[PDB]
Amino acid sequence: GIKGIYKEIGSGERISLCKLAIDHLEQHNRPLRLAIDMAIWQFQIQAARGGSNPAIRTLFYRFVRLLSLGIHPIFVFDGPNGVSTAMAKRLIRLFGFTAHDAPGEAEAECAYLEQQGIVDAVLSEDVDTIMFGSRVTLRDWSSEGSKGGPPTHVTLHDAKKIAEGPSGLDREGMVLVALMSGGDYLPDGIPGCGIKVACQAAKAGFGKELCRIKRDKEAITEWKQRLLHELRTNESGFFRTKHKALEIPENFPNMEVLRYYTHPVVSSPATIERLRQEFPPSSTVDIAGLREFTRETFDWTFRPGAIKLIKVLAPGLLVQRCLDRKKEESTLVKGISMRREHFSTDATPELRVSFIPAELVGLDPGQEPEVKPFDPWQPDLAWVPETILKLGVPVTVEDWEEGQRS
DNA sequence: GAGCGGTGGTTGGT
DNA sequence: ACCCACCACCGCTCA
Ligand SMILES: [Mg+2]
Secondary structure: OOOOHHHHHOOOEEEEHHHHHHHHHHHHOOOOEEEEEHHHHOOOOOOOOOOOOHHHHHHHHHHHHHHHHOOEEEEEEOOOOOOOHHHHHHHHHHOOOEEEEOOOOHHHHHHHHHHOOOOOEEEOOOOHHHOOOOOEEEEEEEOOOOOOOOOOEEEEEEHHHHHOOOOOOOHHHHHHHHHHHOOOOOOOOOOOOOHHHHHHHHHHOHHHHHHOOOOOHHHHHHHHHHHHHHHHHOOOOOOOOOOOOOOOOOOOOOHHHHHHHHOOOOOOHHHHHHHHHHOOOOOOOOHHHHHHHHHHHHOOOHHHHHHHHHHHHHHHHHHHHHHOOOOOOOOOOOEEEEEEEEHHHOOEEEEEEEEOHHHHHOOOHHHOOOOOOOOOOOOEEEEEEHHHHHHHOHHHHHHHHHHHHO
């Protein structure tokens, strides 16, 4: 749930992660900070086949993509209140990313971190994050349109635009929507009441009123008999019809379920404060660590496996190295050859950069046993956001720019 | 989780 | 008695 929510709030803006990451880097002068709920992986990585551990392999490639986007991720795990959690946490550490355990539900924690300013957006499986206080919420990190290929885009929902759009649904309203019609995930919901009726009750204002009331029987019995009377007669015309068959359980509205949404179990103030000092971390990618991980987990063994790690990892490391920080510069970028504004990044300016993968990664395939091909000591080419390049290798970008103006 | 067509119930009107 | 539009719910499909 909430089932049919997108008919009411819109299915969302659809947008390149690159574009979000780079717009934010341009506006706020630092990389986008993203809370990712580790639940999004369950039905997404199971399609992967072949080789060893194809599910954690896809996680690996998504992490390399995050490096390329220059995004500081914090992956949030559910708390007590077939990819191992331990293996995921290890791979997260190796990549210099952050792992965080929610005390309860991860989506609630993700929204909380956003509210408290630890992250700028949440990436989650659905828009429940909005009932929990999220303002910018992303879902469905995946490829675009008829292209069954690389995952470049996400679906963005803005709690502010939704509240001021046709649905009227803000945090308060949705809350009512699922007390009244969330009879599968929650107790004492109204049988026969679905999204339409619940929604037009939210609009009438019943969700605002309910959220501003002590959890004070005298006033919660009042609200109920306004709502109940209004459903029966539609005197104010808040509905499209009368609803006399709609029978309301004695125990509705369950105030303990209201508690679960308005005051969800999240980290303590002390924990929020530790995250302010420690996130994002000052961590670099553990290269030797990842070499050992990929040997053990994917059987990327011996020289072929060393060369495979290098090819896959190097564009990522380049971007990451750029965002850290008469002047060398070349130790990252050998040259630039072209510029484009591609539909896949929603016209984010990119420069065609050259680099030496093995040099950049710092692994020598020769120290490992031998068993049109890819040579990691030849120059490789990658498109990299012009903005990132300007921060990281400014005089190379300048030199290319004059080259162009001639 | 989210989209889809069928279906069975409700409502308000023929 | 019955139609009709709307709706919530169900199982089924991609995950
Ligand atoms: Mg959810």
